[PDB]
């Protein structure tokens, strides 16, 4: 009946201060946001638009698996022509309660 609560990975009580290391999967983001991508070329003489659910940098291409980076397949682009890309971020209507995103709290114990 209740969502999965936050999870403490590590703690440190250092000079009267608490430093908490939370396991952060960012599910609240992953489930609400998505990208809408617009591609224009000359073949393709009309604006092609697609949606992105996963922006994960896994592979197994000769690229990278690092952080501070996002990966996604862009259909409609041809290497021989000039193409213009334009991205937008859109929210998921299912995440809203009384027109408010991420509307609620969560319950945890530090002991």
């Amino acid at each position: 009946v209740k969502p999965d609560p936050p999870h403490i990975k590590n703690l440190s009580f250092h000079n009267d201060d608490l430093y908490v290391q939370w396991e952060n999967p960012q599910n609240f983001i992953s489930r609400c946001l998505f990208y809408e991508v617009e591609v224009n070329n000359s073949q393709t003489e009309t604006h092609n638009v697609f949606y992105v659910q996963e922006a994960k940098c896994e592979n197994p291409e000769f690229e990278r698996n690092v952080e501070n980076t996002s990966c996604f397949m862009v259909p409609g682009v041809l290497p021989d022509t000039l193409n213009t890309v334009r991205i937008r971020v859109k929210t998921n209507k299912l995440c809203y309660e009384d027109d408010k995103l991420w509307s609620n709290w969560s319950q945890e114990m530090s002991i």
Partner: antibody
Amino acid sequence: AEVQLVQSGAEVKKPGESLKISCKGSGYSFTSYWIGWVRQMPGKGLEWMGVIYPGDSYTRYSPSFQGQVTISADKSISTAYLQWSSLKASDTAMYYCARMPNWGSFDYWGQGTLVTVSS
Amino acid sequence: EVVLTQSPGTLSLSPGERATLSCRASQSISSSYLAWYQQKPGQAPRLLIYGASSRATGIPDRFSGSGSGTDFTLTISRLEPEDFAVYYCQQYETFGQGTKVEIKR
């Protein structure tokens, strides 16, 4: 592998009995997408039941379906569930589970589970 | 909530003809949230178009979605015998009542 959602077998239950249908997804990141439940009564159209985001089990229900049924998930076995505590004859329908990206469309469907409730 | 009305309820056409199904939304909706589905007798529905105009994987070129705000259209250019089924438009918790596309004889 290709995306596939596989649902549990046909059920013939008496009114007043509990029931839990399962939906097992494969060929994709189970927790990356939501799972929806759609009802299709004999000879009728489609009805959006409710949805779950397996990642954090964030569940939403259509007003017609709230408090009538329970949507749950088991990350570990790539499974989504729909359940009634006390079935009525009026629950007789085909039930489909489907995969849904954040835009709300259902891109892959389960084969359906036929539910028959009678005295 | 949002209510989608499909027109007509039954479309009677010959194979090879042009099919235009319409989906009217009660309120103006974002084109990214509208999708069309096909459902053959005794089969699970299949998604054809999402985001009002984007074809799903493997959906042939004959199916094209267009529309904006309140008036959305599904177009089957040339009708192949497989194309005679029930088509539904949807935005989140809201589904259309369906359009059966049948063989006119």
